[PDB]
Amino acid sequence: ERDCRVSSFRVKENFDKARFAGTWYAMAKKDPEGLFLQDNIVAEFSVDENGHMSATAKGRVRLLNNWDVCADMVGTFTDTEDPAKFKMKYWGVASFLQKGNDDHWIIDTDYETFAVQYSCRLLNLDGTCADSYSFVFARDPSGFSPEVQKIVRQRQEELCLARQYRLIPHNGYCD
Numbered sequence: 001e002r003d004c005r006v007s008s009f010r011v012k013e014n015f016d017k018a019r020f021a022g023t024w025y026a027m028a029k030k031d032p033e034g035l036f037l038q039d040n041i042v043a044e045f046s047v048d049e050n051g052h053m054s055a056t057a058k059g060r061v062r063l064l065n066n067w068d069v070c071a072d073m074v075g076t077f078t079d080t081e082d083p084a085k086f087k088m089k090y091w092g093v094a095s096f097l098q099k100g101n102d103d104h105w106i107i108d109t110d111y112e113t114f115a116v117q118y119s120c121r122l123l124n125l126d127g128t129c130a131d132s133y134s135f136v137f138a139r140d141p142s143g144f145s146p147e148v149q150k151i152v153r154q155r156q157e158e159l160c161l162a163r164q165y166r167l168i169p170h171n172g173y174c175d
């Protein structure tokens, strides 16, 4: 029944980059394979005068060898035929942090309260995603109204990611 083909997924209608700017607290995440941000994750989005979107982000990550560090990350986004779908180039302030180029899709947002983000890093032969990640972001660090929670849950189901997220703490560690 459920179509899990990435090419089928709905994204945010008439996505507005400028209204999306500012501070976004990560409340929940679905992990990909390998090294990934762990917790204390906060993003800052910006858009310049020509419509070019970029972001910084902080979060705790534990390395190779179990070393715990505060990652300071940077991303730059390229626009596509769909206003809600981007290519994100990313790197760290420290040279040893992971660098890459990921799809970056805004699945849904009301710009003032929540956002659901998605990235498929690898397609299966059948069109479904072999390696994804997803953030649930909030403007306000706290639990979301029950009304907003219901909508977020539905979006998770539509991405074929329901029941695959974990809650993320904030306790300072990265200042």
Ligand SMILES: CC1=C(/C=C/C(C)=C/C=C/C(C)=C/CO)C(C)(C)CCC1
Pocket (backbone or CB within 6 Å): 035, 036, 037, 043, 044, 055, 056, 057, 061, 071, 073, 074, 075, 090, 091, 096, 097, 098
């Ligand atoms: C840049 C960037 C993002 C992704 C960051 C990633 C993927 C970080 C991974 C870091 C690693 C693996 C560090 C250890 O080397 C998100 C989607 C939050 C949006 C804001 C900008």
